[PDB]
Symmetry: none
Subunit: 163 residues, 4 copies
């Protein structure tokens, strides 16, 4: 059950469960190049799923997690949104950080295949706020569907699953 500012929102589909294998995808980078699930083969992955990364309001917690998670051995943080590739560079949480990709699902099926596209509310069609963590093999270890789209994810619990 997702909500927006208290009011009820729903997502098309369902988020992956712990133990399920990560679903394939094709996302677009800021230079219009494509990234695929194969690009992360054998590496521990954090899917950082946003309604938008073009809001301009970063956060000490949001930045601190992306820095810490990248520091982890053989780990990558992957930001997904419906934002066009022309705005992916505006994600401040990846400023100066390595091992952090910011990718666009503007023409993909990530939101569909992962059950995160929002179904109603003025944010309909955007992704919901969610975090999916997978291991080196690719099976989901931890998930969170943030109950309130405005609130930040439990970055500490997400980090702990990686640890």
């Amino acid at each position: 059950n997702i909500t927006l500012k208290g009011n009820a929102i729903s997502t098309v589909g369902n988020l992956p469960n712990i133990g399920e294998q990560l679903k394939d995808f094709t996302l677009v980078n800021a230079d219009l190049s494509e990234k695929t699930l194969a690009d992360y083969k054998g590496k521990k992955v954090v899917l950082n799923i946003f309604p938008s990364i073009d809001t301009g309001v970063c956060a000490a917690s949001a930045r601190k997690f992306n820095q810490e998670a990248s520091n982890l051995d053989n780990t990558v943080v992957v930001n997904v949104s419906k934002d066009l590739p022309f705005a992916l560079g505006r994600f401040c949480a990846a400023e100066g950080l390595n091992n952090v990709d910011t990718l666009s699902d503007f023409r993909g099926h990530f939101g569909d295949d992962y059950g995160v596209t929002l179904a109603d509310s003025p944010l309909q069609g955007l992704l919901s706020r969610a975090v999916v963590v997978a291991d080196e093999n690719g099976n989901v270890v931890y998930t969170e569907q943030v109950p309130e789209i405005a609130q930040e994810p439990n970055y500490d619990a997400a980090l702990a699953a990686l640890k």
Copy 2:
């Protein structure tokens, strides 16, 4: 049509002269929605972009919006696949009245108007095109910009409003 010299193709065709404008629902930057009904009885210019978040001073586009807005009962509407969160970076509508910049990120404007790109690295974005309609709503003039990078023939479009 071509993109940076190589040939690109669009899903569909632009509307024909004499045909009525197809309905749509586009989203404003403040997450408000606009519909074809919002422009009933007004001459409409549809300015269709691959992106309005390119970062290039739209000097020619700003000159058109200033002249077109000065015209009686005329509206300029910018349509692109950019999220409503990026519409504010379109400067050509800065300080100009009767000019909307709207998002088709969750609509079917691009398909309904036959402008969505079918191949090339810009696949899924709208192609560069211009549609001018009369007050009744019948399409008067169209332009499918041959080179997606190139700017529209804003002078010919302005003439249709006249």
Copy 3:
């Protein structure tokens, strides 16, 4: 001063009110050079940017550049580390006279004015700062924007020009 909230520091210190402006050599968009001599006897506004190539409409700067140039014997000079090849993308000075956009990519204006950033991912770029001087060349008013993202106090800076 802060950069996106975190603390950043600049190599040096801004000039004080009453001091003479230090000389410089900046490059225009067409690869020509401009010097402090180019503004002798004219009231000068130094608008110092980390970048003018960010893609933002800079509504406030356009209102300042329009008003300041309307003033008699006054020039606005935008300085940044952007190469001369990108200066054309600063839209707020488009079509305005007596407003220059210059590059310090091979000078030490940033050093001589104490605005170059020493750390942070923006290290090597200029900080957000404003220096206003009179016709004789002595600084009358300055502003070091505490947060690089925020817009300068264009109203207080303009007052010094008057």
Copy 4:
């Protein structure tokens, strides 16, 4: 030469047989890339006065398509352009295995002896191509005689082969 008149560079380009010197360049997202990021990969150093020209040449587009397709090969564009303008390199349109980096605060241009010493382009990198093998030894270099002219992309490509 530049527009017929003679131009000079601060330093000298690396010689064939020499190892690639380290560097620290900036990506468009303000991230840093180093020579270590390309260890064991075939490297083409594509050195520009500016990539903010807005009109990518036919020969240049063909090279990036062919070179990037090559197995264990990377094309690296280095220029003095600020990272905010690196995105204006059109020749890398949609392509993988092509990086565009900035030397606006590094010493790539100095350490590689390509920074221009005079002419209106003073301070910018010269037009040059440096190709090295997987171990890092320079196999091919070119100092483009006219900064406006395009490099001999075929001779560079042959060194990769």
